[model samples]
Target: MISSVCVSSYRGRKSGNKPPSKTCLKEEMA
Candidate 1:
């Protein structure tokens, strides 16, 4: 469940104008 959420969040950030934060990168790795 957590993994899916992290992936979607990462994708959204990547597609958006803003870059993913260090915290977000950590979540993607996780």
Candidate 2:
């Protein structure tokens, strides 16, 4: 299993709109 990186998180970091979501790293039960 692996946690996928969120495509949206970097934008938030760049935009400085808000904190990157913790749930952004979604789990994969591979």
Candidate 3:
């Protein structure tokens, strides 16, 4: 796993528990 924050190929295991952050993912992408 990347262990950074969010991921593109990610699949959440909980509901409304830990939502993915698109902006966070953008950081790595940028």
Task: Highest TM-score: give the candidate number.
Answer: 3
- Give the C-alpha miss distance for residue 12 in model 2, angstroms: 4.1
Per-model C-alpha lDDT, please? Answer: 0.37, 0.37, 0.38
Q: TM-scores, in order shown?
A: 0.16, 0.16, 0.18
Cα lDDT of model 3 by residue, 1-30, tens digit? 343565433444332223344323434532
Candidate 3 regions exceeding 4 Å error are 1-4, 7-24
Screening candidate 3 with a backbone cut-off below 3 angstroms (N, C-alpha, C), the clashing residue pairs are none
Give model 3's TM-score versus the native structure.
Answer: 0.18
lDDT of 2 by residue, 1-30 (tens): 123555434554432222444444434211
| Clashing residue pairs, backbone N/CA/C < 3 A, model 2 | none
In the predicted model 1, the residue pairs found to clash are none
Model 1, position 6, has a per-residue lDDT of 43
